[PDB]
């Protein structure tokens, strides 16, 4: 983030992190995540250090904004936890979304209809999206994966340690990554609260959709 | 023909010819 | 048990160079070993290196770079002459434009070109290219 | 759009083998077989025997 004091925790981002739950992870250790972590406690939940997560979120934002054209940034998700978040992320930034059932050979087979030659890949989860990571080897695609404590670190380039199992955590982090890249692009200022809604990027089940829309107007 | 009974037949032939040589003198 | 200490040290640093590790631990130490990496570091193949000086045989930690291909030994230490040096470097080196042979010499442990230009030779130690 | 050429009869030997040479798209059943493909069966006279032709 640099030594300049404009890109740190103001007062409330850490409060949103502790409310959503981006600080506690799984229950097994990983040898590539031995530094993005502090200590295992009782009940066996490892705690992720938060400043390192913030620094790699700045690093991923810098890597996204570094390329001039935003139309060739492929954002990828297949799990139902982050279908809406990547779609509205691509709507906010101008990225190209793939949401649910990523086709094999999208970057390799060139005569098929679903063909794309992008420049940057942004991946929700490395274990679930192991097929884009394999297809990112044959063509020169750098990638950013929101990793967990129980995610293998294979063919990855920027790892952001977080709990990618709760919908609030992934929705908030996709939203604030969009916030950071639109701040770095030169459209959003840091001085005022611009924010639309943190819940606007959240996936929610049809049962709770039905009961809350019946309870509310 | 496996090796066990081939070895047994060679052993029996060797025993017979050795007995014939030792009783021939 | 351990007999050729230089062979173990060069096998360890070759494995560390192959797997891309920046630093490696060498468990024993000797004057011949530290003179060998002095020759290597003067030639520019490696970088800085420390000596863990204690009351036993010391330990060496090195700062490797990517300019190293392979480290090897010649066991046992055969003796060579000035006539037979070209026979060794014709079949022990990948090219005649780089790569060096380190051999023990009464004028000091040194590379093959210095031994050629001061006209002396001795028992062989190993190679690096 | 497609073609099928087959030659049957005595071809280099006494056992009568048939050789088939196909390419392209070709249907085999339906009402449009009446008005998309054409049939022709001819008999060829040789010194050693007769050969059949079923071109389509």
């Amino acid at each position: 983030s640099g030594a300049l004091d404009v890109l740190q925790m103001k007062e409330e981002d850490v409060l949103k992190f502790l409310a959503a739950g981006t600080h506690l992870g799984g229950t097994n250790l990983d040898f590539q995540m031995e530094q993005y972590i502090y200590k295992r406690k009782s009940d066996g939940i490892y705690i992720i250090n938060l400043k390192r997560t913030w620094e790699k979120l700045l690093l991923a934002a810098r890597a996204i904004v570094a390329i001039e054209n935003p139309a060739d940034v492929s954002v990828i998700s297949s799990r139902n936890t982050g279908q809406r978040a990547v779609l509205k992320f691509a709507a906010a930034t101008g990225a190209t979304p793939i949401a649910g059932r990523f086709t094999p050979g999208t970057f390799t087979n060139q005569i098929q209809t679903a063909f794309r030659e992008p420049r940057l890949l942004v991946v929700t989860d490395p274990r679930a999206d192991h097929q884009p990571l394999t297809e990112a080897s044959y063509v020169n695609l750098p990638t950013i994966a929101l990793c967990n404590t129980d995610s293998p670190l294979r063919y990855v380039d920027i790892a952001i340690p977080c709990n990618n199992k709760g919908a609030h955590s992934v929705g908030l982090m996709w939203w604030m990554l969009a916030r950071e890249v639109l701040r770095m692009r030169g459209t959003i200022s840091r001085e005022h609260p611009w924010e639309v809604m943190p819940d606007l990027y959240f996936y929610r089940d049809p049962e709770e959709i039905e009961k809350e829309e019946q309870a509310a107007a | 023909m496996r090796a066990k009974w081939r070895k047994k037949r060679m052993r029996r032939l060797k025993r017979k010819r050795r007995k014939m040589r030792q009783r021939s003198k | 048990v351990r007999m050729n200490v230089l062979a173990d040290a060069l096998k360890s640093i070759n494995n560390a160079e192959k797997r891309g590790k920046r630093q490696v631990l060498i468990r024993p130490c000797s004057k011949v070993i530290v003179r060998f990496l002095t020759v290597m570091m003067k030639h520019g193949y490696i970088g800085e290196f420390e000596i863990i000086d204690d009351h036993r045989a010391g330990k060496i930690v090195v700062n490797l770079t990517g300019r190293l291909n392979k480290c090897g030994v010649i066991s046992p230490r055969f003796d060579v002459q000035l006539k037979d040096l070209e026979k060794w470097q014709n079949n022990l080196l990948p090219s005649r434009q780089f790569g060096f042979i380190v051999l023990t010499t009464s004028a000091g442990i040194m590379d093959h070109e210095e031994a050629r230009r001061k006209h002396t030779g001795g028992k062989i130690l190993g190679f690096f290219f | 759009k497609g073609c099928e050429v087959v030659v049957s009869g005595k071809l280099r030997g006494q056992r009568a083998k048939s050789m088939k040479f196909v390419d392209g798209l070709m249907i085999h059943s339906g009402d449009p077989v009446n008005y998309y493909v054409d049939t022709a069966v001819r008999h060829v006279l040789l010194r050693q025997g007769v050969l059949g032709i079923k071109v389509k």
Partner: protein, 71 residues
């Protein structure tokens, strides 16, 4: 080799002699029985006298009467 001492020459030489004795083409040329059993006795050509003309058959599928001479 795998016995690689600086003062290992007689062991390597004896092992090489024994493993070279364990051969066929060298054992044919360096033994007296393999040349004693040769009909020519180590000669290129030889002369002989014909006593009977014998006709022999052939091997598997290729079958023809090949004609030889007993000398």
């Amino acid at each position: 080799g795998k016995c690689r001492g600086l003062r290992t020459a007689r062991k390597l030489r004896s092992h090489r002699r024994d493993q070279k004795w364990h051969d066929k083409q060298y054992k044919k040329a360096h033994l007296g029985t393999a040349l004693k059993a040769n009909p020519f006795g180590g000669a290129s050509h030889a002369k002989g006298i014909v006593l009977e003309k014998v006709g022999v058959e052939a091997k598997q599928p290729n079958s023809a009467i090949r004609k030889c001479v007993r000398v």
